[PDB]
Subunit: 268 residues, 4 copies
Amino acid sequence: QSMLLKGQRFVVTGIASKLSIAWAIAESLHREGAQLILTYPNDKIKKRVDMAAEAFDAVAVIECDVGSDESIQVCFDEIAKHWGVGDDKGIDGIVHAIGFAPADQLDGDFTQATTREGSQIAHDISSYSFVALAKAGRELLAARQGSLLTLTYEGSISVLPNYNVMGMAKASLEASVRYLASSLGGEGIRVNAISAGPIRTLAASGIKSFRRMLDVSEKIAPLQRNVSQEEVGNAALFLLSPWASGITGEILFVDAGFNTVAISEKIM
Amino acid sequence: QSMLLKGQRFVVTGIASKLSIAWAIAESLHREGAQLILTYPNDKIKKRVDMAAEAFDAVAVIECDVGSDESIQVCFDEIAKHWGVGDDKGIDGIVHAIGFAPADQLDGDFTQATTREGSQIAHDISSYSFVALAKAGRELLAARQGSLLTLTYEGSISVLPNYNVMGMAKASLEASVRYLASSLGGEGIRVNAISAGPIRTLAASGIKSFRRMLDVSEKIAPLQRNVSQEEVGNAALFLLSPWASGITGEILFVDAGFNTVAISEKIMM
Amino acid sequence: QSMLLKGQRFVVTGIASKLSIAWAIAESLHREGAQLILTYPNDKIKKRVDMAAEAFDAVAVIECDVGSDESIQVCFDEIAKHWGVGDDKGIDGIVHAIGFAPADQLDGDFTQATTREGSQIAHDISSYSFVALAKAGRELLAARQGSLLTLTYEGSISVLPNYNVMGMAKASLEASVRYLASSLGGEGIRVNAISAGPIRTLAASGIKSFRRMLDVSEKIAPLQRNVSQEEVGNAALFLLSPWASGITGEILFVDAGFNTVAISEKIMM
Amino acid sequence: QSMLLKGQRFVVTGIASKLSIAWAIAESLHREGAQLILTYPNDKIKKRVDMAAEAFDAVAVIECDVGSDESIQVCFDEIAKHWGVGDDKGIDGIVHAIGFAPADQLDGDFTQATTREGSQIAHDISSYSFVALAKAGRELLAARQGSLLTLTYEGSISVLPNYNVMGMAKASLEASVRYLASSLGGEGIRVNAISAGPIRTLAASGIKSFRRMLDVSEKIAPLQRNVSQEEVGNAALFLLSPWASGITGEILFVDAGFNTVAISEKIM
Ligand SMILES: NC(=O)c1ccc[n+]([C@@H]2O[C@H](COP(=O)([O-])OP(=O)(O)OC[C@H]3O[C@@H](n4cnc5c(N)ncnc54)[C@H](O)[C@@H]3O)[C@@H](O)[C@H]2O)c1
Ligand SMILES: NC(=O)c1ccc[n+]([C@@H]2O[C@H](COP(=O)([O-])OP(=O)(O)OC[C@H]3O[C@@H](n4cnc5c(N)ncnc54)[C@H](O)[C@@H]3O)[C@@H](O)[C@H]2O)c1
Ligand SMILES: NC(=O)c1ccc[n+]([C@@H]2O[C@H](COP(=O)([O-])OP(=O)(O)OC[C@H]3O[C@@H](n4cnc5c(N)ncnc54)[C@H](O)[C@@H]3O)[C@@H](O)[C@H]2O)c1
Ligand SMILES: NC(=O)c1ccc[n+]([C@@H]2O[C@H](COP(=O)([O-])OP(=O)(O)OC[C@H]3O[C@@H](n4cnc5c(N)ncnc54)[C@H](O)[C@@H]3O)[C@@H](O)[C@H]2O)c1
Ligand SMILES: Oc1cc(Cl)ccc1Oc1ccc(Cl)cc1Cl
Ligand SMILES: Oc1cc(Cl)ccc1Oc1ccc(Cl)cc1Cl
Ligand SMILES: Oc1cc(Cl)ccc1Oc1ccc(Cl)cc1Cl
Ligand SMILES: Oc1cc(Cl)ccc1Oc1ccc(Cl)cc1Cl
Ligand SMILES: [Ca+2]
Ligand SMILES: [Ca+2]
């Protein structure tokens, strides 16, 4: 409870449950005195975004299915009504916390499991959607010299069992972080990612052997534990804050050091 | 002219002209005594693949538009007729040398220029196609314990003007190199990539400011020059050869050292 | 002026002038309500550390030449007197902001300029010193579950003119960040680095063509500018703070995005 | 047995036994028709270098303790007698296959085990020695537009138990690959490294849990096995060959894919 984001405004995608990393990012931003707009992709998920809206006193709760150009365009329309008008216009940040590939893509042998359409959807929802948000948000961001933040996973650069086409999408996503940074930096907009360690979330639960992943990680990670959503929330807060004014194009690992260790006493 | 690939067989995609990197890869494999099957995506491009078939005495010239599952499945059917059968069955390698994004994606400001469909096509043709080839060729490869090779570019990990959506696709492609390696290694199949520096090819010609890119590169690269197609051909030959038996999941830079320099003396120029 | 480091304690090396990156790190920690101990390697430099002691109300100003095991051991003795004792014992962080190689190592052609002793001194003062601080400070750090922070430069992973032996030392330093993280993590100690872009500091001033380096950087960096000491100070504050509790072994670039660009439009200039 | 290095000359350091990676590199170069000069750091090790000299018909066997400027200067003196004179002067390559840190540095907890002098020696012998060879060899290399090759290990960029200060040295070494490449490229000299997976060698045997490292690696590596010295030999041959004319500053992993996998069914 400091007051680092007093009067700052953020759009937060990807809340699905109390376990969502985006939930904790919202919580961190709210704690620090920012105002929030929260998005949801459909009615089932709206139920849970509404709970988050209540807990964080969201300014609005707007539909945003990042699969639709119409949905995104309309969503940023609504946001502009609230935050695009009058004396203090603009937004300080947009949080992209959205991943999807069809479940079959992440079940078993990579070459067997990957399909043309699976790949298409994985890249579209998990990677292009970040640039889609940047396109719709550009002017709002430029007005306040805000930043974009996405979430990635080590699966982009190292192989983790079953991660498969999501690895291809995350690698694609991370390239976009760099291209957007180069594209938007001249307007004072920063673009960054957090590479989170494994955390029990709705999506996480869906991956074969994720539980085992969680166990192994704890035994590899220098801190001898996994990270919590709160720890990613705080790191996100930093990157979204004026304190990160010199940082763009950056991938920040929040994984208890996991990415730095090839083998531990897994040996034993 | 050594004889390092005597009696070995390779499928080579991506020949579009005498300037194609894939042309030089074919040339290197042929020089070393390998047999080739060459593929073409359409009739216009067949004209030039046929010239390469003549120069390299290709075993066959088969249609392969990597945008179509049908086209790929048919293509690897044809290749199975030639190479799938008998006591000598299998292929030693498949060379993926195919990139595409709609031209508009690579024209100016990244955020402005990138579109949902542009992205879709870029990843589909430039990245997924590599796994598509691995899927169709797996059995043929396993029979000889062959390898796959693709071509990437530094645009995956560093920003280069206009490269844009192709950078996203190349990053995706490189992740697939790693996933395919993990997936196919237990069947003795290796999967690798070459990150070539900039070279004047038909696709290269089409990128705004490519000529200028070429000029700056020459002044940044430790060897004070750009690489030729032949130098990529030779490196590809190595990775496709039994000499690279211990190497998989690898990205090998053939860029005269360009990727290792942040700034050169040019500090002046 | 928030109060994020209320009642936290930090040791800050590497203040040599008002321009030092370590000066701004001290300033950020003080601004946020932390107490500081500041170190100096010799009497000439003490003059400037004393000015920083006045501005930031340092708890103490202690000698610490990281070239001497004795000097370090004595220094951490003194700091233990102040901060080692009682129900509040321990330190929240140690800031390593020390680089040195003999000037001749950084003057021109790398192979010509690098010497056995130059290399020895560069690694000893620039890299081993970080583990030296971790060894002397381990117990104090563990008591509060604090962290170590060093400063590196892209010269470790990419070539920059004249950086030379300092590039070898920084690469070594970054490996130590990882080994220390692995070694100390089980005691709840985090170990991280900031890779700062180029900034006019006393050491920076001494590098041939640094001014030119600064000019090109500004034209390559996505933000179209260089960073200030303050921006490194703020990022350092974060990594030293409880907000970075889940982050260890990390190299965080604070360079306005410079490291992510291979070539900009400058293709022209 | 092709004839790719006909009439080419290479200096090969680091032969200590038949298990030395440098042994197999010599073997690969000889097989392909190159002539070799072999070096040894002292009399004990000379016994084994002499066996290699017999097997590969070395042109000379010269002393080179890379700890001494005198020793290196004298060594390259002798080499110049053989290969620096007359019509066809120069060398096509120098193979650096030398690592050392005092044994205590690699036994147990990194922070406990590392010492000021241990670090000094590790960097001096394992990293500076590569530039020392480049300095002494520059003119011989430039005459034939030869290349330098060193050997590194993933320990530089990822943590492996006990590798410790050798990790710091290897990271330093790899930076030197890049600096030397930049420095010498204008004279047509290339500079590269191979990052070999774990292989049973004299030095390897000396590291606590190396045997376990070997076991774990086999279960992580995509090829489901470790690499042999021969496979590194062949890759070294390529990098030292005219076929690698476009390649400088490169780290080439010869590790059966190990570096690319964060976790396998170590999970199981
Ligand atoms: N260990 C981990 O859980 C972990 C680690 C690193 C990265 N990540 C990344 O974190 C981000 C958030 O995921 P999470 O782990 O908190 O899981 P989660 O299930 O809480 O969040 C995933 C979100 O994606 C949203 N989404 C899916 N398709 C959408 C669409 N078409 N339009 C809009 N939203 C859509 C879902 O509604 C959901 O809120 C993802 O990008 C994920 O890949 C997760
Ligand atoms: N500087 C460079 O030229 C450079 C640098 C590194 C990477 N590469 C990569 O090397 C590969 C070859 O490109 P190039 O420079 O030799 O140019 P090129 O124009 O010769 O090759 C591109 C090839 O892709 C083919 N292709 C496009 N869509 C296809 C489809 N649907 N089905 C089948 N083939 C299709 C074209 O027919 C053509 O042969 C590409 O992956 C490219 O991105 C090029
Ligand atoms: N552009 C930049 O300025 C830049 C970029 C990134 C990295 N860094 C790193 O940041 C750190 C601080 O450098 P700076 O640029 O602020 O310059 P500076 O000249 O202010 O700092 C270098 C410091 O090292 C100290 N030092 C040297 N030998 C010492 C010894 N034996 N014992 C104790 N202290 C000793 C000097 O007293 C001085 O305070 C260094 O590690 C430097 O390499 C600087
Ligand atoms: N798994 C592995 O064995 C492995 C993997 C990757 C990297 N490497 C690297 O391979 C290289 C060769 O080592 P190896 O594994 O074949 O072991 P090895 O014991 O066969 O070779 C090490 C060599 O270093 C030499 N050396 C040590 N100090 C010297 C000095 N002062 N002057 C000259 N020579 C000196 C020794 O005489 C010996 O020949 C080393 O650089 C090593 O770090 C080894
Ligand atoms: O990327 C992730 C990485 C981890 Cl370790 C855990 C959860 C993740 O998030 C996802 C994983 C798969 C799918 Cl289909 C969608 C999402 Cl959001
Ligand atoms: O990847 C490349 C990199 C460079 Cl430097 C030059 C050409 C390249 O190849 C392409 C670039 C754009 C498109 Cl649309 C298609 C292809 Cl094949
Ligand atoms: O690492 C640095 C990087 C830059 Cl861009 C500028 C200054 C740096 O700091 C040093 C450079 C050389 C020496 Cl001898 C000592 C120090 Cl502190
Ligand atoms: O670097 C190596 C890496 C591995 Cl996995 C195995 C052996 C290696 O080589 C050495 C390791 C330690 C020391 Cl003291 C000296 C050398 Cl030559
Ligand atoms: Ca980082
Ligand atoms: Ca490589």
